[PDB]
Design a protein around this nucleic acid. Structure first.
Length: 200
DNA sequence: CTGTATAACTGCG
DNA sequence: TCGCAGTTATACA
């Protein structure tokens, strides 16, 4: 059972992959195993200013690949068992293959990500992005680029739950921005995995 | 009267 | 507490 998220230029799908017990166990393993970037590899350039990201970021994937956004180039660490497990299961459910994962960890509600598109050149054309979430439920927001205005297109708000999958299909990242806004009342951490296909 | 894009912040309301 | 506007210790097209 998928919840289909559809608006003008919006093709996305939402389902729960794992029940609480399995998702807790996976979350616990991710906390133990995932190594996040620090220092120089945790700073981005936006509107002429360099900033430390208000979260932690990690990349894992096939060797030779890189991911660049906002003046920050992230190189992938080799795959680890917990990530291959999540990847293989997602690939089974969707029929899609992934060679890269960007991991975002929001320690609480003050950690967030500003709105953006996954529009980078090293992303394979038309390829989906698989967004898997563990830990605290957080509100995810889809916003149309012509509404931020020429178009009065309504915003799409959606909670991403523990053990859930959000499939972001083409042309979502062409027309729609997304963000995880600050939620002050959230005190627990959240780990999000966006599986991607990267051009060699 | 008129270039677009901008993964973050501040300065508001 | 939340959300919007503007923005540029800029970079193109």
């Amino acid at each position: 059972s998928w919840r289909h998220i559809r608006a003008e230029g919006l093709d996305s799908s939402y389902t729960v992959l794992f029940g609480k017990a399995e998702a807790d166990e996976i979350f616990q393993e991710l906390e133990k195993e995932v190594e996040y970037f620090t220092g120089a590899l945790a700073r981005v350039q936006v509107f002429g200013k360099w900033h430390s990201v208000p979260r932690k970021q990690a990349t894992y994937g096939d060797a030779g690949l890189t991911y660049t956004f906002s003046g920050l180039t992230l190189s992938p660490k080799p795959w680890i068992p917990v990530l291959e497990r999540i990847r293989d299961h997602v690939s089974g459910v969707t029929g899609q293959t992934f060679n890269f994962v960007l991991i975002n960890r929001y320690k609480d509600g003050s950690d967030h990500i500003c709105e953006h598109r996954d529009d980078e050149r090293e992303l394979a054309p038309g390829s989906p992005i698989a967004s898997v979430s563990f830990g605290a439920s957080r509100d995810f927001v889809f916003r149309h680029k012509d509404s931020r205005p020429s178009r009065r297109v309504a915003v799409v708000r959606l909670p991403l739950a523990h053990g859930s999958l959000l499939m972001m299909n083409h042309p979502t990242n062409t027309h729609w921005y997304h963000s995880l806004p600050v939620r002050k009342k959230v005190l627990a951490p959240r780990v999000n995995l966006t599986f991607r296909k990267i051009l060699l």
